[PDB]
Nucleic acid binder design. Sequence first.
DNA 1: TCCGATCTGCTTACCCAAGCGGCATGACCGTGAACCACCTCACCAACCCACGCGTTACTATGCCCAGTCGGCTCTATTCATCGAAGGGATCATGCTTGCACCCTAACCAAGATCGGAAGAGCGTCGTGTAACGTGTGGA
DNA 2: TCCACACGTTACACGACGCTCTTCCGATCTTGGTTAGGGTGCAAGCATGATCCCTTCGATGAATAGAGCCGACTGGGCATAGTAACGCGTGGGTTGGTGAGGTGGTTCACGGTCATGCCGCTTGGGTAAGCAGATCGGA
Lengths: 94, 98, 81, 82, 107, 108, 94, 93
Amino acid sequence: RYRPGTVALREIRRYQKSTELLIRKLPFQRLVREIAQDFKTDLRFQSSAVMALQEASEAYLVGLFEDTNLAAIHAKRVTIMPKDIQLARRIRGE
Amino acid sequence: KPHRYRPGTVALREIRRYQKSTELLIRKLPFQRLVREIAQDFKTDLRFQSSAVMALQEASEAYLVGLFEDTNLAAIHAKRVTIMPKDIQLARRIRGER
Amino acid sequence: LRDNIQGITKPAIRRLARRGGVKRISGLIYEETRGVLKVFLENVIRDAVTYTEHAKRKTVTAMDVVYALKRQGRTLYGFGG
Amino acid sequence: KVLRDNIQGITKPAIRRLARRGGVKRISGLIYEETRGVLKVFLENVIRDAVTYTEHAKRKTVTAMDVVYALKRQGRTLYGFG
Amino acid sequence: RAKAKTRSSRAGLFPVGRVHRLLRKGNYSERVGAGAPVYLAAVLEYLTAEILELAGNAARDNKKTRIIPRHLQLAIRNDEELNKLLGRVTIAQGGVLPNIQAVLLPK
Amino acid sequence: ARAKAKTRSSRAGLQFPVGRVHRLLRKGNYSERVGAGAPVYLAAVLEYLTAEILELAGNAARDNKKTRIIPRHLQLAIRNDEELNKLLGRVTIAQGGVLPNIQAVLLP
Amino acid sequence: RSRKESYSVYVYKVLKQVHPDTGISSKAMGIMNSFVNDIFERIAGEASRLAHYNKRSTITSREIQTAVRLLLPGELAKHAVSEGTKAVTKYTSA
Amino acid sequence: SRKESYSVYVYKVLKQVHPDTGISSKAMGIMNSFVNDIFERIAGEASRLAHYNKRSTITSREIQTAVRLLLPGELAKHAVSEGTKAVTKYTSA
DNA sequence: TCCGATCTGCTTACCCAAGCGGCATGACCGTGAACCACCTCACCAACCCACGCGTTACTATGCCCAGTCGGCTCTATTCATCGAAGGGATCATGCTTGCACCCTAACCAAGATCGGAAGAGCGTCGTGTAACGTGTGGA
DNA sequence: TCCACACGTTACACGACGCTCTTCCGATCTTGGTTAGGGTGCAAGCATGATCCCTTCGATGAATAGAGCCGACTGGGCATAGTAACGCGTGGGTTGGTGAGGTGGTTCACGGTCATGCCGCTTGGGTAAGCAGATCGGA
């Protein structure tokens, strides 16, 4: 049994070496179609549009998690917390 | 037996005073000389409109005040009230300037 | 479509954070991150829909999403040009 | 008139006043040099863009509108000078 | 000819002729319709009226009958829509807003 | 056209099209007129930037024992060069992945 | 010796309509002119890009309305759209 | 329709730099997107520069100054040198 | 007795408020004029609208296994508390230099005027590029 | 082993060529205006030093909750077929935006000029911080 953190580094290396999408195709598509239901009813989506939305969302989330990890390390911690996310979003401009 | 304020009180008074006011905080002549020296590496014998130096000073002070706000937030995040160079570096790293 | 935000599962958030270089994760950052993610989408999709509604179209093309992302200062290369 | 070592004219009290306007209660003694370096970098970028704008117009005086355009290029629009 | 009433009075508004001229000689489009200057002038007038009303309210709260850059900054940053619109905008002689973090306050 | 059609891209010794760039500058509504030397300069700059990115991407692909540039190699080339990274700082490259950077604090 | 057109006549009529007993300083006048010019440039650029993306060579009320919807946030966009629509209706009514 | 793209020119440049290295269709699409983005950036900056000086023509000076403003550091220097070389080779027949 | 809180009771700098110069600063009249928005007729091309057709977006079905969900262990991580010491705050002195203000001479931005090169725009056309088809090799 | 890519072939449409015509750009001159530099006075904000507090950092220990492992389970992705919603193209009509020529209304600029809003200065009071003193809970 690996100690807590040994497999975390392996996962970090595996998911930084790779380049595939991390969120599943169908749940994200349903989320996008549900979010777009408050702006225009009976709205159709292109496949490339949903793919582009998924790439943009995952890139934004990865950048946000990088900033959140930077903030958490700044506070003498390795565990990222919602306060780190809030600080990163405030400093960034959101 | 002089009257000495406890540390942190005059700092709060100055915070209120300098947030209630609008004037420029950097001295005008030293900043003008600094701007002229900086503009020497780009063109020789340059001339500066007074409004140009004033606009540069306004922008620099606004940028530094915003950076100090972000630095104070990053310092308070680390459970401290004293702002260090680490907070400035983190604020500029998250903002996307380094 | 009802309550599809919970489709962004905990393992998906964990993988996204692992790609971001995060070693340990607090248990309360999932329900936070999802919200943040939704907010991001609630912006981009909105702009995309507007770009569609100006063109008298129904299908949200990939170029609408590309223009919406370019509006917010996040250019996306690879899709539609 | 050749100017040298004028970045020290952004004195410690001036940085203190800027921090107080920023809402800072305590200041580490080693932050003044970091702030001076940050200010020098920002001024270098803005002044370089302003000088480029000026010399494109075959001019020798940096106007206020050149600084305004440079700041707009940096992404920080300035209101008050044009 | 005719009595030649301006477009700014036909629409009930800010100039419409000047906005049209800027739209033409601003190199935005090959042609400019007759509804673009009116719509743009109306939008600009609405935004100006909103920001000026908020600035005047701030001035009245400050007991001064003259809007200054500080009043404009207070009006812009005290609203949410205006602060979202002009978040990335620096106002000369506008100062900052009197906020202090709760941690720094005395115990 | 009595004389043989000599493309302006061959006159400037470029590979990118100067005629297409001139047409885009004209019909893109940037100004009333465009000079003859503006499309040439723009095409030269575009060709230089493309050559730089392609050279770095080819180096990255050769480092990975691959003989075909994919988006991952483009992202690696962009992020590993300071000037290109500063230039393309806000853009996101689809299927480009993330640079393998782990903070030293988290490491054992 | 050169004309310098500015929005100083028109943001004083608006000020006298809103607050009939309040003046405005020269610095605030310049800031208001800069704000009006910046908003004009933003809306005009957004409308130009919208017309170019649709392969159009005109800027009608639709392009300006879509630009206003894109830039102005929340209730500001709705109120500005209502004001622009009302002004256009008044203009084409006479 | 007849959609236009920089695919053939990007491929020519790639064959010039790397003689025996291909390029993926997605990678070529990303290259075309990058070229279009940089073209629009430089053209917009040149238009703004021309309008600031009350000019009416984007000549090579506006493009060179826009290149100086956009590209950072050594990239700007090398792009300016390459553009000047190309423009001085073009005017000499 | 005893100890740390806990009022409590002066002091004591600090800031906000009110009133009197007094001043420079907008608002406005008064021309004045240079500008340019408005009116009107030609017109032609961008736009509108109906119709056709082929993508392609959505739907329904089957399944299966890799991914997900939940629980159990437990141990690395986080948080609370103490000591302290030194890093930074606060205040008194002395004085350096930025600020106020006027002259000058140099220097440069703005306006006018050829006049010559240069870019739009016309018509022809003949290569270059995209669009498709099919072998074939890089992952 | 294969499905994405790199070689043809066609065909058409758009960049190049030539010429006209109009319109910017460079050279040159002139003139006002507008900075850079220099000079003096001074007073106030900066530099330095003393004193001291309370913030932050290291140590130590509790606690806690997230990572790792494992069993159950179940829906995302792949394969298949079907159907119509709609995006793009095409053709004919049409209407509205540009261009040109007058023509006065708008607007910018320069000069008082004048209330007059606001600032400097002084005075006065509300106020909250700060330290010494008396008291009070239990021990």
